[PDB]
UniProtKB/TrEMBL annotation, chains A, E:
Its main location: mitochondrion. Binds 1 heme c group covalently per subunit. Zn(2+) binds at H198, M202. The gene is CYC1. It comes from Chlorocebus sabaeus (Green monkey). Heme c binds at C35, C38, H39, R118, Y124, A157, M158. This is Cytochrome c1, heme protein, mitochondrial. Keywords: Electron transport, Heme, Iron, Membrane, Metal-binding, Mitochondrion, Mitochondrion inner membrane, Respiratory chain, Transmembrane, Transmembrane helix, Transport, Zinc. Component of the ubiquinol-cytochrome c oxidoreductase (cytochrome b-c1 complex, complex III, CIII), a multisubunit enzyme composed of 11 subunits. The complex is composed of 3 respiratory subunits cytochrome b, cytochrome c1 and Rieske protein UQCRFS1, 2 core protein subunits UQCRC1/QCR1 and UQCRC2/QCR2, and 6 low-molecular weight protein subunits UQCRH/QCR6, UQCRB/QCR7, UQCRQ/QCR8, UQCR10/QCR9, UQCR11/QCR10 and subunit 9, the cleavage product of Rieske protein UQCRFS1.
TrEMBL record, chains B, F:
The gene is UQCRQ. The lineage of its organism: Eukaryota, Metazoa, Chordata, Craniata, Vertebrata. It comes from the Eukaryota. Component of the ubiquinol-cytochrome c oxidoreductase, a multisubunit transmembrane complex that is part of the mitochondrial electron transport chain which drives oxidative phosphorylation. The complex plays an important role in the uptake of multiple carbon sources present in different host niches. The keyword Translocase does not apply. Keywords: Electron transport, Membrane, Mitochondrion, Mitochondrion inner membrane, Respiratory chain, Transmembrane, Transmembrane helix, Transport. The keyword Transmembrane applies. GO terms for cellular component: mitochondrial inner membrane; respiratory chain complex III. SUPFAM superfamilies: Ubiquinone-binding protein QP-C of cytochrome bc1 complex (Ubiquinol-cytochrome c reductase) (SSF81508). It is found in: Mitochondrion inner membrane. This is Cytochrome b-c1 complex subunit 8. Belongs to the UQCRQ/QCR8 family. GO terms for biological process: cerebellar Purkinje cell layer development; hippocampus development; hypothalamus development; midbrain development; mitochondrial electron transport, ubiquinol to cytochrome c; pons development; pyramidal neuron development; subthalamus development. It is a single-pass membrane protein.
TrEMBL record, chains C, D:
Belongs to the cytochrome b family. Heme b 1 binds at G33, H96, R99, H195. This is Cytochrome b. The cytochrome bc1 complex contains 11 subunits: 3 respiratory subunits (MT-CYB, CYC1 and UQCRFS1), 2 core proteins (UQCRC1 and UQCRC2) and 6 low-molecular weight proteins (UQCRH/QCR6, UQCRB/QCR7, UQCRQ/QCR8, UQCR10/QCR9, UQCR11/QCR10 and a cleavage product of UQCRFS1). This cytochrome bc1 complex then forms a dimer. A ubiquinone binds at H200. The chain crosses the membrane at residues 29-55, 76-97, 112-132, 139-157, 177-199, 228-249, 287-307, 319-339, 345-367. GO terms for biological process: mitochondrial electron transport, ubiquinol to cytochrome c. It holds the Pfam family Cytochrom_B_C. It comes from Chlorocebus sabaeus. Residues 209-378 form the Cytochrome b/b6 C-terminal region profile domain. Residues 1-208 form the Cytochrome b/b6 N-terminal region profile domain.
Length: 239, 81, 378, 378, 239, 81
């Protein structure tokens, strides 16, 4: 059975710790230049990047880079136009049969909730991305599979997707495989759960309040029940 | 039906009470309440706890056994060739 | 007269929760009914809101929930609240049942029977809500639960196909799940009112098991503030579960949409069901398995009939208490076994746990009661 | 005692409809309440079935109804029954109100007020069902009824946009219509039970307007068989309407799907609404129009206050009777005007009919009552 | 305003009269060869013709005549196949913009409920089909409109669609314009309301029953109420 | 509350009844019932009917007037050219 991922010290794992938005910005470049060849992200749109790592104008600029189908026009025909904020990240394949045809029968999953749809979360993915190696003695792989101990079965269709200097970050960070993996993983965390930071923000407040209300109402209860708690009885028959 | 006018028949019982504003809400905690809780734990310990201890032993045993069952047996390859 | 007593609606309210005579000495175990009602109300409200964004169609159900959690303002927390409220609802339900088993309150026959009805209804409701997201676990849960009626010997398969509305699970079945999940909670509400009507004709039992008519106090102000305290505590727990650790009870396999061609290797229902699942797993025969599954709950209806003790409560009955806690551990064991693969150690342990559950309810408790009677010389 | 009287649930049933004392002399006009209840039950059943095939989405609503009427086995007659039952429901409702206006039963204040509440609820429900098919008339009906709140001076437009869930009528509004249409009937049911609870504290008024406690008969068997006869008659009429002449009340413009860019030249709501529409059409001012629209129904609440007569019923009061029938003809006139284009003859006639409606309720009847009193010398 | 259609004596208008299925069979040929060039019938499929005027085999034969898009295939591409019973009558245009482009801005409506969506029903349509003529003096028509008094406005985009011998019926009936119109109208009646015949069938039964139940229950009522209806009172004070 | 034991106080009233199986359900229709219905119609005719007659006149008038209003006036073209 599959190998259990170890726990990495992620800076957002504290009870009130927020995500590192720099790592999100770099992870998103990783997902543009590499991982959006095979994979779809059907539930994210450019308008979602605004106020997270981009202004509205710059997100429009990202959008503009992509052609999108639209129509019908006044003649009843379809056409192509540049993108807008309200368009969803584009799909790599038109249908899953075409996706299988382009990957030797295997279907790459959608990464919009991959971090919440796998045991271990971002610990697993990192483990999977860094974890390829040569197989043991006695093991063999059929046509077009790789070996990876952190996959269930240890045979996986996906070739090692990243290596050192497979891209360059615009902030000058050195692009070693490990750095790339950590950053794309942070970005998938954000893609799976946007409410993260605001949720922790809101916890502080309303937990303080609900904690405060316990002793107060307990005092009120004790006040009303003191009458019975100190009551004294006696029995006085005429005998 | 059931109403505070005619619940039961009682004779010769006297009661005494203070008002809440005359007395304290948490009068004696560490000198009376704590020992009382301690005896209250004592009086029930051996009627509840050992069953759960047995559950814990069973759980750990069954886990260990299942995990042993997944490891390769050397005699399955060494014995005959 | 005061207006409190001037009028039928007002006088019913007064007899219910202002001048009702309650025992002075009942403990925290009696707070869980009001918490149950609170939970029902919470569920109905959060459900009416969710309803206005969900899509009962197999080609958009999943994505409608995605829409709710990503684009609707604070929709994520409304989702979180609904899902965690169900869990709290069952926690309170189990504790509520257990009280009555321990303290002998099943001797209020009408209240007990209406309670059993309510348990059944709530379980149906919870399950029919669990399949609406149309994830990978939801689909196969639906499949199993609707194949259950194939065990009926003469008419079963036809019943299955008449509930499906077709040759297989499909779009016509999801709308049925959604209509039923919409309507059941309100039937639950009405039956809850009947339940309390039956209760108030006798009044509450208490920990000692002896008649409390010499020391009744009014419901207001004492138990009003006590139940308000209980509610505050429940809200603290619910908030911490909703905001600080939302993924504690969550299942990853339901974040993969449904695939009619593949069942995943490791199958596991929602936690409040595991134990039944274990029971269902323990019988090597189809019909017998289903029969055991349903008897496991229906057996509560004959506990009043097997009662031999002169005393009502277990407070003064130690052998009884020992058996009670052993029964609770058997149920924990079934819950644990339900989580594990169907492999040999767990198979054998589950079979023992099941036989001991029925054994204990049907044989051991009656006999210990007789021994106890003999030790007190009556 | 007999079991009839052994138990609270049974004894409430007995006090309701077995040993209840009813007047001996009440007429057919008292059958229409039971028919109302029957209609509510019919509507709930046929609705629960339809619900399992309908689609609350603007891109498939229309076609889901097409699917129901063409492919579902006998779905066409279930549709027919639902639609015609609504019409019967309002027929009975109007006759039920009119009785009480004629025979002075508004002096049972609680029953009367709960009746007004029920009228309002039923109208809301009926309208929110009428927009679900998403035909060409449904769409513009929705539009008008949701723009009504723009008349509130300070907060109105924001209310409109908060009910729409967007910049305009659209997909988010249809699911709201459907959730509300699902939940309201059950609130109606509960309030009906309260209505009857209030009634049974006093008992039924009768045609003569004098106290009937010297000649009470039991409800069973007399009124049981009488109401069963009434139900048989209602079913005969309903079947003939459903099977022999289904298109009598039908509207062709709702067999064209919705087009947000074109309102059709001739606009006409469902018949039980025409009269309000006419009233709304008669005031050349927005706010005043809406105010009149709502006052037209809310005015029933002050009829008990304007009552001057020594006698309760109109049975012995001829001038009164003459005015009553004149009022009924004014309402017929408003219904007829509602059907006609907004052109000059009908504009003028509608304005006169409206002024005469309010005039008659607020002025003429009180004064005729005083004249009558003087003629009998008290 | 529009001219009011007269009432024609249609053989199905009696309370218990059924439709003439021969006229349906001919009307359907009219709708194939002529009227399905412009118009869609989105809510009818070939399986619906079975047991009305065709066997299952012959309806399959009708189906087979038409190509229909299907897929994706195993490569991820669409293809064309012959029709089946469960396919819907084919559309003439891909979208309504294309329909307008092909009819000089006007949009032909769907005829699946045209008979229930117009005042006068099949009286109107017949009137419209037979009713074209030359305009009055003083009247003029803009580019591409015809005159027809039974249209609201009297100007209509649709040119006269039928004439004598515009098709030939397979049963040898002479194809005069009037005959063609009457038959297509019968067919539209059937397309708008399939439950017609069975509905009338069912009325006979359950109306007989509900009519029978009235006097019986009335007798039962009278029986129970005779006690009060013949009661006699007297007043006897000691005086 | 309201119950057949204590509704009101009455003295010196005698009643007589037959059983349903002793008597006829529709004893005399054409010799008694028909004339009674006739007088019952007579006693209410003039309190109900004339209002509806007036409604009918108003309806027909308004229809006729509206339909006249839609016909072309010859003086609209003949008068000045
Ligand atoms: C990041 C998440 C953060 C989460 C933070 C959560 C914070 C929670 C704060 C809660 C504060 C509550 C305050 C309530 C005040 C109410 C006052 C009142 O009136 O109370 C009456 C009520 C009792 O009612 P009663 O009228 O007496 O009736 C009861 C019985 O009938 C009486 O019958 P009896 O008299 O016979 O019984 C006597 C005795 C009976 O004794 C026994 O039966 C024997 C027990 C023996 C135990 C021995 C030790 C253990 C076993 C060892 C055995 C040996 C093992 C050997 C192994 C060998 C292996 C080889 O029982 C007691 O005395 C029990 C007292 C203690 C109650 C503890 C309650 C725990 C609540 C836990 C909540 C968890 C959820 C939180 C939310 C989490 C969200 C993620 O309670 C009390 O009197 C106690 C009040 C104080 C309770 C404090 C609880 C604090 C809990 C903190 C938990 C933090 C960790 C959370 C972890 C979460 C993991 C997911
Ligand atoms: C314009 C901005 C908003 C302004 C809001 C102003 C109101 C603020 C809130 C006021 C709450 C009410 C406080 C006073 C309640 C008085 C109740 C009373 O007198 O009745 C008590 C007496 C008790 O009964 P018995 O026991 O029989 O008495 C016998 C005694 N030996 O009567 C009753 O039974 C209770 C009657 C309750 C009446 C309540 C009336 C409430 C009126 C609310 C008006 C709100 C207006 C809001 C306007 C908003 C803008 C349009
Ligand atoms: C999210 C995951 C949720 C998992 C499931 C959660 C629910 C199950 C929880 C199981 C553990 C519950 C422990 C409760 C505390 C026990 C404390 C204890 O032993 O105290 C004993 C103390 C002794 O008091 P007395 O005898 O009255 O006399 C004292 C006065 N002189 O109190 C009692 O014995 C009271 C017992 C009341 C009933 C408790 C029931 C607990 C379990 C109920 C649920 C079990 C499952 C369902 C059972 C019924 C199935 C048909
Ligand atoms: C196997 C194929 C199906 C076979 C079906 C067989 C049953 C057919 C239908 C039978 C209907 C019932 C008729 C007999 C009812 C007798 C009721 C009775 O005895 O109770 C009357 C008496 C009246 O009360 P008091 O007024 O206090 O009396 C005092 C008198 N001085 O008691 C009551 O209050 C009523 C009690 C009602 C009990 C009804 C029991 C119904 C049993 C139905 C069983 C159906 C089984 C179906 C099996 C289907 C296949 C698995
Ligand atoms: C599908 C299209 C539906 C169209 C709308 C249908 C509903 C409206 C129908 C209007 C016509 C109703 C006619 C009813 C029959 C009238 C018979 C009649 O005049 O009989 C008079 C006869 C006289 O008897 P008494 O005075 O009691 O004394 C006799 C004993 N010695 O009976 C009566 O007067 C009884 C009158 C009872 C009330 C009748 C109410 C009729 C109209 C009600 C609905 C009107 C609209 C709503 C009104 C209220 C609006 C706030
Ligand atoms: C085409 C060369 C791909 C690129 C570029 C990336 N991935 Fe992919 N991935 C691909 C295939 C054909 C598969 C199927 C594997 C199988 O055995 O079926 C996958 C799968 C994944 C998974 C799933 C892991 C699991 O346990 O199911 C993940 C999490 C994944 N891929 C991630 C991922 C990332 C981060 C990439 C960019 C760095 C990436 N993939 C690129 C094909 C291709
Ligand atoms: C293309 C040459 C057409 C053929 C062949 C048929 N119709 Fe048609 N129709 C066409 C157009 C462009 C329009 C729009 C008219 C307009 O003014 O917008 C129509 C319209 C109709 C209507 C609608 C009538 C109404 O009052 O709305 C009907 C009922 C209709 N057409 C029927 C019909 C029939 C029976 C045909 C076959 C004999 C037929 N049409 C053919 C274009 C064309
Ligand atoms: C929706 C589900 C339920 C609701 C809302 C509910 C509600 C309540 C409430 C408010 C009380 C008041 C007393 C108390 O809180 O202890 C109560 C008592 C009671 N309940 Fe229920 N209950 C439910 C389910 C059940 C079930 C499942 C059972 C049994 C199997 C049951 C049996 C009882 C009994 C016996 C009592 C009275 C016992 C006593 O007073 O000693 N109820 N219930
Ligand atoms: C006892 C009352 C109720 C219980 C126990 C209950 C339980 C549940 C559960 C367990 C789920 C699935 C949770 C998940 O998938 O994460 C669910 C979903 C849902 N329920 Fe409720 N529910 C109740 C009342 C209601 C009511 C009254 C409505 C009214 C419409 C409603 C509407 C919904 C909807 C729309 C969903 C799907 C949305 C989603 O999955 O998040 N529920 N319910
Ligand atoms: C769903 C709507 C309603 C239902 C189901 C309903 C039901 C009933 C029933 C069953 C009765 C028994 C006596 C009878 O049938 O006459 C009744 C009486 C009565 N109803 Fe309602 N009703 C409804 C609406 C209304 C409305 C709209 C009004 C007034 C505006 C009203 C006012 C009354 C009054 C005053 C009585 C008693 C009058 C008398 O006994 O003389 N009700 N109702
Ligand atoms: C007082 C009770 C009710 C009234 C007056 C009422 C009225 C109506 C009306 C007038 C329509 C439109 C009819 C048409 O378009 O031909 C409708 C549609 C509908 N109603 Fe009801 N309804 C009631 C109860 C219910 C209930 C309890 C449900 C439960 C789901 C329901 C479900 C539906 C559905 C799904 C539709 C759309 C299907 C269709 O248009 O044929 N209704 N209702
Ligand atoms: O029809 C009723 C009536 C009631 C009979 C039972 C009906 C009913 C409706 C539905 C069900 Cl499931 C059961 C009973 C409701 C109306 C009732 O309470 C009265 O007080 C009354 C008084 C005079 C004339 C008629 C009546
Ligand atoms: O195999 C099962 C299975 O057996 C059940 C079972 C659990 C017990 C349920 C149950 C039925 C009736 C009662 Cl009274 C209680 C629980 C029925 C469904 C599931 O819930 C399930 C969910 C998802 C995938 C597979 C499965
Ligand atoms: O113009 C209108 C219109 O004015 C109403 C009106 C009718 C009266 C309704 C009404 C509102 C409130 C009450 Cl208490 C009663 C009736 C509100 C909608 C419609 O129902 C309608 C339907 C379809 C197309 C256009 C229209």
């Amino acid at each position: 059975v599959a190998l259990h991922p170890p726990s990495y010290p992620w800076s957002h794992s504290g009870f009130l710790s927020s995500l590192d938005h720099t790592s999100i910005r770099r992870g998103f470049q990783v997902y543009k230049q590499v991982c959006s060849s095979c994979h779809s992200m059907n539930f994210v749109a450019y308008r979602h990047l605004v106020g997270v790592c981009y202004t509205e104008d710059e997100a429009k600029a990202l959008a503009a880079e992509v052609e999108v189908q639209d129509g019908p026009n006044e003649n009843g025909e379809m056409f192509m136009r540049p993108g807008k904020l309200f368009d969803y990240f584009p799909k790599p394949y038109p249908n899953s049969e075409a996706a299988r045809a382009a990957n030797n029968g295997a279907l790459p999953p959608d990464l919009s909730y991959i971090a919440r749809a796998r045991h271990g979360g971002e610990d697993y993915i990192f483990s999977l991305l860094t974890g390829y190696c040569e197989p043991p003695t006695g093991v063999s792989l059929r046509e077009g599979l790789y070996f990876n101990p952190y996959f269930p079965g240890q045979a996986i269709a996906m070739a090692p997707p990243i290596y050192t200097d497979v891209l360059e970050f615009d902030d000058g960070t050195p692009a070693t495989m490990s750095q790339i993996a950590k950053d794309v993983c942070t970005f998938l965390r954000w893609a799976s759960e946007p409410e993260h930071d605001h949720r922790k923000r809101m916890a502080l407040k309303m937990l303080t309040m609900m904690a405060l209300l316990i002793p107060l109402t307990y005092i009120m209860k004790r006040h009303k029940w003191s009458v019975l708690k100190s009551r004294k009885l006696a029995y006085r028959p005429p005998k | 039906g059931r109403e505070f006018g005619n619940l039961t028949r009682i004779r010769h019982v006297i009661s005494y009470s203070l008002s809440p504003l005359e007395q304290r809400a948490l009068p004696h905690v560490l000198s009376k309440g704590v020992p009382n809780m301690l005896r209250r734990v004592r009086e029930s310990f051996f009627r509840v706890v050992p069953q759960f201890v047995v559950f814990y032993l069973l759980y750990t045993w069954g886990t260990e056994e299942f995990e042993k069952s997944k490891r390769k047996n050397p005699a399955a390859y060494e014995n005959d060739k | 007269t005061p207006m409190r007593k001037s009028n039928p609606i007002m006088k019913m309210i007064n007899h219910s929760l202002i001048d009702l005579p309650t025992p002075s000495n009942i403990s925290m175990w009696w707070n869980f009914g009001s918490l149950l009602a609170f939970c029902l109300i919470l569920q109905i409200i959060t459900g009416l809101f969710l309803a206005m964004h969900y899509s009962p169609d197999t080609s958009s159900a999943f994505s409608s929930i995605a829409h709710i959690t990503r684009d609707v303002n604070h929709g994520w927390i409304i989702r979180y609240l609904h899902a965690n409220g169900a869990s709290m609802f069952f926690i309170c339900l189990f504790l509520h049942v257990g009280r009555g088993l321990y303290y002998g309150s099943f001797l209020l026959l009408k209240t007990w029977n209406t309670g059993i009805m309510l348990l059944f209804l709530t379980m149906a409701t919870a399950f029919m809500g669990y399949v609406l997201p149309w994830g990978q676990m939801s689909f196969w849960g639906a499949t199993v639960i609707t194949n259950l009626l194939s065990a009926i010997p003469y008419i079963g398969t036809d019943l299955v196909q008449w509930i499906w509305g077709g040759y297989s699970i499909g779009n016509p079945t999801l709308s049925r799940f959604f209509t039923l999940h919409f309507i059941l909670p309100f039937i639950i509400t009405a039956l809850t009112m009947v339940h309390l009507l039956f209760l108030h004709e006798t009044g509450s039992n208490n920990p000692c098991g002896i008649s409390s008519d010499s020391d009744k106090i009014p419901f207001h102000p004492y138990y009003t503030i006590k139940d308000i305290l209980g509610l505050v505590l429940l809200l603290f727990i619910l908030t911490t579960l909703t905001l600080l650790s939302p993924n504690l009870l969550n299942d990853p396999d339901n974040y993969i949409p449904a695939d009619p061609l593949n069942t995943p290797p490791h199958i596991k229902p929602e936690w409040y069901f595991l134990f039944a699942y274990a029971i269902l797993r323990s019988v090597p025969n189809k019909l017998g398995g289903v029969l055991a599954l349903f008897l496991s709950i229906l057996i509560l209806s004959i506990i009043p009939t097997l009662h031999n003790s002169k005393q009502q409560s277990m407070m003064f009955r130690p052998l009884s208490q020992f058996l009670f806690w052993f029964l609770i551990t058997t149920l924990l064991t079934l819950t644990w076994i339900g989580s594990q693969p169907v492999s040999q150690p767990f198979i054998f342990i589950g079979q023992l746990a099941s036989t001991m559950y029925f054994t204990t309810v049907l044989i051991l408790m009656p006999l210990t009661s007789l021994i106890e009677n003999n030790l007190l010389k009556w």
